[PDB]
Chain A
Amino acid sequence: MREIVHLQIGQCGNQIGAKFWEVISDEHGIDIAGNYCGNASLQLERINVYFNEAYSHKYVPRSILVDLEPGTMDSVRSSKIGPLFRPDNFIHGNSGAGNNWAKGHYTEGAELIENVMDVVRNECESCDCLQGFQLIHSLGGGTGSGMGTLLINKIREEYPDRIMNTFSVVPSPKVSDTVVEPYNAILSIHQLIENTDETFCIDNEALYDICFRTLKLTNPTYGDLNHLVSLTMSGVTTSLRFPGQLNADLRKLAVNMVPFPRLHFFMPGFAPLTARGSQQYRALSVPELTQQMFDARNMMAACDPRRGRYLTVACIFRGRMSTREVDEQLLSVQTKNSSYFVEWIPNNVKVAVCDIPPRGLKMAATFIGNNTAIQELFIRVSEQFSAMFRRKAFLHWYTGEGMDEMEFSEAEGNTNDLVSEYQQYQDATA
């Protein structure tokens, strides 16, 4: 029996992970006391990937909540999910990294790696078999980005035969006013290129765009964005949480979706995306779900997939739908729009149907795609990095923590080489 170890680093990672574990426990029929209360036996099957079953039917998650400040742990414990998590798995330092990637990767991160690796080894030693690691963090902040990439490197050192999956939240100028978030984002992207096998590029710019245009919110808070990411992260791991045809159990998902070792940045999407308290007025059927699944306005990365080629698609449908109509609609989408898919990867669109929908929606459609359009996201973050780096603003806060100035140029060169490789595999034809 395989099992994923979940890690949440930073304020954004902790808040999104708390909402994610709430939606996962609602889907699996688990209350906050760790007792099963669903009416279906499918929810109890393949529960060992995420929930650690203790004695007398106690379902505690295998979440390692990590920060450098105890305020996020106090905010998690202030909610209903505080008693749900393991209290020994909360790790927080004395002071935060303060939007400094070097201060979260070289000093405070380095002094907290031994404690978090002790907790990681404590979770790992009780495994009958380890599947891989799932990390939720943000590339913008200091502790999230810096200690996330440090924990990624340390996990890659200790367990090099295990897969590494990240849910990396790329920062935006439309949601945060901090200026050095391109520095942390580009340095973490340079680490994630070389030290990770699976990355779900969630962009706060795309979430702000969805909450601004689609959801009709004048002032989108962090709650609406975290609700969107919790919906998409619940729908993405519905292949891991449930048995199915396209099981895609982490290593199988990486074998299917990743053709090239650096092009492992996915573009998640969720077709009936609606704000809280308003999802009961959505008409749901198959071809509207398929036509909203591939929409650029609906997709959760600030990219235009019409300007790129889908290298590999993993469309997972959720709810009570006829799989004949789902497969007919997706083959119609693949054939009628054959210019948007690569011709050198035959049958790159994989369809699965899970009969358990997320709560609040009768039918749902979660899309995972290794599209080539994510080079627009990397071009945007690298151009903000170049605008903040060509005149060396705030480099003294990074070089004062022991970071060389060559590391910023190495990160810029690595992200530009990744953009060049994406453009090369876009322009090539079989």
Chain B
Amino acid sequence: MRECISIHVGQAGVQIGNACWELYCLEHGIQPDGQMPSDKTIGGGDDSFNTFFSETGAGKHVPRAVFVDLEPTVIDEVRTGTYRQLFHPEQLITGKEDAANNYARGHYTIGKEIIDLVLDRIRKLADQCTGLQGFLVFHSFGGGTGSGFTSLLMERLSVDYGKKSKLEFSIYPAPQVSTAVVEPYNSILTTHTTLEHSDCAFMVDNEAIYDICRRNLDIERPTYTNLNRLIGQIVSSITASLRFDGALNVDLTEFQTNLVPYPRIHFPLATYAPVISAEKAYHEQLSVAEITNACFEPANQMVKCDPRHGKYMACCLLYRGDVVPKDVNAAIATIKTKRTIQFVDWCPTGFKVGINYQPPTVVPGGDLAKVQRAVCMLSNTTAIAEAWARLDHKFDLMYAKRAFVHWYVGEGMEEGEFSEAREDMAALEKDYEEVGVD
């Protein structure tokens, strides 16, 4: 009755989604060939992981995934890896020419020659689903494909699936691991284009994942594998309310109502406490109050910004593992006695705690340690305006002398689209300030 179609646009989206589907199969116990030991005894669907894993007649749990790139490298990497038979070859779309870290290439010239094939695969996956809620678009703000083709896809899915709500798991650019210089340009342009076409966007920057990996997993050179494993853990326990039993956030509409008051203020911030290295596995344990405090720690967020200078709007605390609901309320009361967390001047509800008793599973061979108590804090705040202000500051710095603009006007775009996207992000900054001023 509820079905979701995960879309992975770009290299970042494809790699993050491959790690995410690996962790989904690990959490649900699904074998890499597609069969299931335990829950294939029934042989039927609608067991709350039929939102993501479609079941065929042979018992194979093929995921509801569409992997898109304009470059066939990472698609062949997932076509060669351990889940090569789990994903259908029709749903793994490759390309010939890249978008070359250009928004206008992936939105107007190179992405326009492949958009109908991806729309055809999306409709082919949607025709199998009878209760489809929407899509989870995995992409990146910086790259060419993951910005331009994601914006084109969001326009097409809004004009074709207008009764559906589309989540996003975007990758905010980091200067520590950056493939290009024009990542502010692509980021501002795809944020302006997917503001009217996205319903709840979970942007996560690689700078916060970089800092968390370096300060917790003790890797001074974090590769893309460690970042992929950590963001796969983050997104997997984001979606753990959706693939499991019903306490809260059981639907994309529930995601849009519990956190998102405005059509334009739709950028929550996730926070995860038990990010511990695999060597420090049996050193100690972690109580509920301290992991709630670390979920309110500003250095543990998925976005490098400070929430104490802004005002909250919502908090969906999502607990994993064997967590008793008694001391969670004591943790809530100790958080509430701290007046650093300051909600808006409407009826603010509070920390909507839901508890899933399934223990969290980490990847064997990964740097993340296996833990018994895990917690995800989805919070809507006005602290994301700092990240958008950083992006618009870099945009203004590069656009003051119109640097790199000829790479965009030469691929079909207009000159005034940059000023239009700058004005739209200025309006988003003004909206976040108007919520922030009371």
Contact = CB atoms under 8 A, between A and B. Distances in A.
B397 A251 contact: no
A36 interface: no
Interface in B167-214: 175, 177-182, 184
A428 B397 contact: no
A252 B100 contact: yes
B184 A346 contact: yes
How many A residues touch the partner, as a band? 20 to 34
B406 interface: yes
A345 B397 contact: yes
Interface string A343-364: 1111110100000000000000
Given A255-B102, A345-B181, A324 B397 contact: no
Contact of A251 (B98, B178, B221, B398): B98
Contact of A344 (B101, B180, B401, B407): B401
Contacts of B403: 259-260, 344-345
Interface string B68-80: 0000100000000
Given A129-B97, A322-B221, A347-B175, A255 B180 contact: yes
B412 to A, nearest CB: 12
A261 B102 CA distance: 15
A245 B174 CA distance: 13
B400 interface: yes
B178 A255 contact: no
Contacts of B438: none
B179 A344 contact: no
Contacts of A254: 407
A323 interface: yes
B179 A245 contact: yes
A371 interface: no
B345 interface: no
A290 interface: no
A347 B406 contact: no
Interface in B83-117: 96-98, 100-102
A427 to B, nearest CB: 12
A274 B108 CA distance: 48
Q: Is the interface of B mostly helix, strand, loop or mixed?
A: loop
A252 B101 contact: yes
B394 interface: yes
B58 to A, nearest CB: 34
A251 B175 CA distance: 21
Interface residues of B, number: 26
B357 interface: no
Nearest to B175: A347
B100 A255 contact: yes
A344 to B, nearest CB: 5
B178 A347 contact: yes
A40 interface: no
Contacts of A346: 175, 184, 394, 397-398
Q: Which of A246, A255, A344 has the most CB of B within 10 A?
A: A255
B404 A245 contact: no
B401 A348 contact: no
A248 to B, nearest CB: 9
Contacts of A260: 403, 406
Contacts, number: 69
A312 interface: yes
B220 interface: yes
A7 to B, nearest CB: 21
B404 A255 contact: yes
Contacts of A322: 221
Contacts of B98: 249, 251-252
A17 B377 CA distance: 59
A271 to B, nearest CB: 22
Contacts of A430: 397, 400-401
Contacts of A425: 401
A222 to B, nearest CB: 37
Interface in A210-261: 245-247, 249, 251-252, 254-256, 258-261
Nearest to B399: A344
A2 B95 CA distance: 11
A78 B339 CA distance: 83
Contacts of B401: 344, 425, 428, 430
B100 A245 contact: no
Contact of A345 (B102, B221, B398): B398
Given A249-B98, A252-B100, A261-B406, A343 B397 contact: yes
Given A322-B221, A344-B400, A251 B100 contact: yes
Nearest to A163: B100
Q: Which of B398, B403, B407 has the most CB of A within 10 A?
A: B403
Nearest to A129: B96
Contacts of A261: 406
Given A255-B407, A324-B220, A312 B181 contact: yes
Contact of B398 (A256, A258, A344, A350): A344
B243 to A, nearest CB: 33
A399 to B, nearest CB: 35
Nearest to B395: A346
Contacts of A312: 181
Interface in A96-141: 128-129
Which 6 pairs of residues, A with B, have the shortest CB-CB distance?
A259-B403, A251-B100, A347-B175, A324-B220, A261-B406, A346-B394
Interface of A: 1-2, 128-129, 245-247, 249, 251-252, 254-256, 258-261, 312, 322-324, 343-348, 350, 425, 428, 430
Given A245-B179, A350-B178, 13 more contacts: A129-B96, A129-B97, A247-B179, A252-B101, A252-B180, A312-B181, A344-B400, A345-B398, A347-B175, A347-B178, A428-B401, A430-B400, A430-B401
Interface of B: 72, 96-98, 100-102, 175, 177-182, 184, 220-221, 394, 397-398, 400-401, 403-404, 406-407
28 contacts: A246-B179, A251-B98, A252-B98, A252-B100, A252-B180, A254-B407, A255-B101, A255-B102, A255-B181, A255-B182, A255-B404, A255-B407, A258-B404, A259-B403, A260-B406, A261-B406, A322-B221, A343-B397, A344-B397, A345-B398, A346-B184, A346-B397, A346-B398, A347-B178, A350-B178, A350-B181, A428-B401, A430-B397
